[PDB]
DNA sequence: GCTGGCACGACTTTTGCACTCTAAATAATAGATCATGCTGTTGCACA
């Protein structure tokens, strides 16, 4: 908090752990060829 | 007759053209903070 955060909000800095969002139809797909790169490749049709 | 500022022939001064030739020693440490580009590392798909 504090107020080196008014500066952060106006500078539009991204946070360290952003929340990932989805699109119009986020059907459950879990993983799709995840392998080494990341994990749980979601494929909402 | 006495005196006080003007010119002249040596001398003197100025001026471009002209090319020159070691070790010491001084400060770091003690702002972070963020953005961006370059380079090496690794996961992924192909013949």
UniProtKB/Swiss-Prot annotation:
Biotechnological utility: Co-administration of salinamide and rifampicin or salinamide and myxopyronin suppresses the emergence of resistance to both antibiotics.
Post-translational modification: Acetylated on several lysine residues in the presence of glucose.
Subunit: The RNAP catalytic core consists of 2 alpha, 1 beta, 1 beta' and 1 omega subunit. When a sigma factor is associated with the core the holoenzyme is formed, which can initiate transcription. The rRNA transcription and antitermination complex (rrnTAC) consists of RNAP, NusA, NusB, NusE (rpsJ), NusG, SubB, ribosomal protein S4, DNA and precursor rRNA; S4 is more flexible than other subunits.
Function, in words: DNA-dependent RNA polymerase (RNAP) catalyzes the transcription of DNA into RNA using the four ribonucleoside triphosphates as substrates. Resistance to the antibiotics salinamide A, salinamide B, rifampicin, streptolydigin, CBR703, myxopyronin, and lipiarmycin can result from mutations in this protein.
UniProt record similarity statement: Belongs to the RNA polymerase beta' chain family.
Protein name per Swiss-Prot or TrEMBL: DNA-directed RNA polymerase subunit beta'
Originating species: Escherichia coli (strain K12)
């Amino acid at each position: 908090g504090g107020l080196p955060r008014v500066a952060d909000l106006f500078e539009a800095r991204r946070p360290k752990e952003p929340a990932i969002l989805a699109e119009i139809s986020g059907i459950v797909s879990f993983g799709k060829e995840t392998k080494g790169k990341r994990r749980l490749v979601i494929t909402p049709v």
